[PDB]
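User: Earlier you gave me the apo prediction for this protein. Now I'd like the version with 2-acetamido-2-deoxy-beta-D-glucopyranose bound, so I can compare the two side by side. Same sequence as before, with the ligand SMILES added.
Assistant: Got it. Here's the input I'm using:
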Amino acid sequence: EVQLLESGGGLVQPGGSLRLSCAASGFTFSDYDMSWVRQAPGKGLEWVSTIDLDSGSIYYADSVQGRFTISRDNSKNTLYLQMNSLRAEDTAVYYCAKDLHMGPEGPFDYWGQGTLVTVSSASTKGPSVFPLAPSSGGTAALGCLVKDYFPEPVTVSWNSGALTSGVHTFPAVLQSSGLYSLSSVVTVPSSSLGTQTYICNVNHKPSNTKVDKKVEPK
Amino acid sequence: IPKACEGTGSGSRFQTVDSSNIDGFVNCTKILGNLDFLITGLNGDPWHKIPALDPEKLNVFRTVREITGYLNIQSWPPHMHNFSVFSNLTTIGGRSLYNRGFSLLIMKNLNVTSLGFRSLKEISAGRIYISANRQLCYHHSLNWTKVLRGPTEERLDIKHNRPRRDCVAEGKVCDPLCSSGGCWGPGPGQCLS
Amino acid sequence: SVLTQPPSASGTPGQRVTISCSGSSSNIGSNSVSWYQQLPGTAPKLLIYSDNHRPSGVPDRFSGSKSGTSASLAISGLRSEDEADYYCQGWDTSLSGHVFGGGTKLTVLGQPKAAPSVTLFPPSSEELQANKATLVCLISDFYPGAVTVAWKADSSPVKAGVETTTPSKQSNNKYAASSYLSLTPEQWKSHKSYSCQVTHEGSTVEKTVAPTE
Ligand SMILES: *[C@@H]1O[C@H](CO)[C@@H](O)[C@H](O)[C@H]1NC(C)=O
Ligand SMILES: *[C@@H]1O[C@H](CO)[C@@H](O)[C@H](O)[C@H]1NC(C)=O
Ligand SMILES: *[C@@H]1O[C@H](CO)[C@@H](O)[C@H](O)[C@H]1NC(C)=O
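And here is the structure of the complex with 2-acetamido-2-deoxy-beta-D-glucopyranose:
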């Protein structure tokens, strides 16, 4: 089965550089024109570049022309985006795309999950994690506040992935400071409190921050 | 009696010429849309279980003079060494295009030794793709600017065919009577103009 | 990347919705249109290519048509699972590049209206002891999506210092949203009460919390 895994994204300073990698499996890499499409948070699709199966034709968007280089290594099943002179507005999720060379089905018959590129003068900041204690016709709400982080993303689980009913993790807020905050709430039964232990697992991989926080009744 | 008929590919029910639909092209002079020759059309489509085309039924296209859209040939009968069934095609319009901007696309036909587009006088728009035809000759000298009615630049993707030196060495070049505009194949009836 | 699309389209289960895509002769007037579905958090998937053809594995309720420089995507037999953003795309001869549309947010309706659940969380003790404070208003299980969020200290309005998320889908296919009032511990001790007010389809739900308890 086909698979495209992107990698190499992260936080980087304007005017800096990064190299994105797309590792391909589940098809003959050499038969496919590969492309890069990006998406700013909460915004539309933007095609970046396309290279053909043999690096014989290469196309770019005017916006990146002279700053990004696409390349490929068919022997390694790897697409490349060398990104130089990065601008804040290059902040985006970068998707890797494939379509059979001169096939009918395309362009971009398959996309990977994307790698996130953040371009900012701001430095890394791990989050403060804080319990949201319940009180408890009523049910009970409880959760975790993930305060003041940069850059994205943060994942949150409950009791190492055991608990998933009633859980909701919110998209983050961008505060005036340039930091991010979000919340993961779990709605639980009225009588569930005081017995069942609830721990949110907060993971901010950019800063290597891992926090488990037990949320107890007030 | 000029007769226009609908083609394949984009904007059409049919994605490729195949046995199911080939007889719909009988006596067409103008194609409204495109012609596509995919591998599934020529050898058989397993998902609709369509039979492999009869190579002699490709002779229907000798009546074609105009193709409004694009020509996309990606599979051809191994014993048909040129596209002489399109000897009467004069105009490719490229009102609709294939992939990233092409009106003409001849690809990976291991057995075609010349093109044979004898009547071809105009490609009104689009880019030209001729690649991986490992045996193709006579196209090296051809004056695409004549046919494209415009600058050749940023319109040619002509790679990886038979190497020019190899064609020259085996005498697979234009007849001396042909212009410097070139030929579509061997001998004097094949000159571009 | 200037293909014109409607920002938004809606329908109820089993309806037929159309999303239009306007371009130019150099892009979708010449070259083919493709269409993509992107569900939230996920990678786009090709839906329609070369104006009207569907990948195998793409159901035939999705259909595409084109005439001149305007293209239409149709979703007959609308489903809850079709709620997504939709992008048209075209190669542009003039640019030697691909040109995407802005995207259309497709919403699937038909569900009963449901009023929002609201839980307002005071600053935690942990947070307070680190000399900071946040009120966390959590808004749950409403339909349809839109809400408006107002804050009050001691009945007077608080506007600056407020940050609110766009509503997004819950596991149970209802909406949730979040809003935050940031506060210094001094201004948290100093007022008698703080309030979070959520207006959903014209009707406000309020929740209130007190530093004293
Ligand atoms: C070209 O078309 C004419 C009819 O217009 C036909 O008689 C002739 O045989 C065709 N030539 C070729 C080489 O197909
Ligand atoms: C076409 O080239 C093939 C190589 O795949 C070769 O076997 C054969 O000689 C050619 N076929 C014909 C019909 O000449
Ligand atoms: C075209 O190919 C056939 C065999 O497929 C051959 O007999 C004929 O001579 C070729 N035509 C030209 C003009 O070379």
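For your comparison, keep in mind: Residues 8-108 of chain C form a domain with the Immunoglobulin-like fold (CATH 2.60.40.10).
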